[PDB]
């Protein structure tokens, strides 16, 4: 079963500033005290 | 000039070598870039 709940107001794109996010550990290794 | 994209192989036992079929395996593995799970038949030893 599934149903199209198409009652949905056609709102514009909304926006926010992703200041400093989405950094992730680039590889599966350990490092410390270093600018890599 | 519109075609079904995909074909049979003509594999009769009368085929010549290289026109004959081969079964193929490819082994893919990454090395040392994580913890690991498949290893060669070697005995470990105590921590010194
Ligand atoms: C919900 O509504 C959409 C249309 O907004 C339905 O989409 C159609 O689905 C049929 C097959 O069921 C297609 O032949 C049409 O081409 C689709 N419409 C469009 C505009 O492409 C959808 O099937 C509906 N789903 C339910 C569960 O009611």
Swiss-Prot record, chain B:
Changing residue 7 to Y: Reduced host ACE2-binding affinity in vitro. Changing residue 15 to T: In strain: 19B/501T. Changing residue 7 to R: In strain: Omicron/BA.1, Omicron/BA.2, Omicron/BA.2.12.1. Changing residue 4 to S: In strain: Lambda/C.37, Omicron/BQ.1.1, Omicron/XBB.1.5, Omicron/EG.5.1. Residues 33-48 are annotated as: Disordered. Binds to host ACE2. RBD also interacts with the N-linked glycan on 'Asn-90' of ACE2. Cleavage of S generates a polybasic C-terminal sequence on S1 that binds to host Neuropilin-1 (NRP1) and Neuropilin-2 (NRP2) receptors. Interacts with host integrin alpha-5/beta-1 (ITGA5:ITGB1) and with ACE2 in complex with integrin alpha-5/beta-1 (ITGA5:ITGB1). May interact via cytoplasmic c-terminus with M protein. May interact (via N-terminus) with host bilirubin and biliverdin, thereby preventing antibody binding to the SARS-CoV-2 spike NTD via an allosteric mechanism. Attaches the virion to the cell membrane by interacting with host receptor, initiating the infection. The major receptor is host ACE2. When S2/S2' has been cleaved, binding to the receptor triggers direct fusion at the cell membrane. When S2/S2' has not been cleaved, binding to the receptor results in internalization of the virus by endocytosis using host TFRC and GRM2 and leading to fusion of the virion membrane with the host endosomal membrane. Alternatively, may use NRP1/NRP2 and integrin as entry receptors. This is Spike protein S1. It comes from Severe acute respiratory syndrome coronavirus 2. The gene is S. The chain holds residues 487 to 534 of 1273 of the full protein.
């Amino acid at each position: 079963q599934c149903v199209n709940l198409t009652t949905r107001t056609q709102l514009p794109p909304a926006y926010t500033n992703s200041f400093t996010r989405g950094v992730y550990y680039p590889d599966k290794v350990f490092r410390s005290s270093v600018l890599h | 000039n519109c075609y079904f994209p995909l074909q049979s192989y003509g594999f009769q036992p009368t085929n010549g070598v290289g026109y004959q079929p081969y079964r193929v395996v490819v082994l893919s593995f990454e090395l040392l870039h994580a913890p690991a799970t498949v290893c060669g038949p070697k005995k470990s030893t105590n921590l010194v």
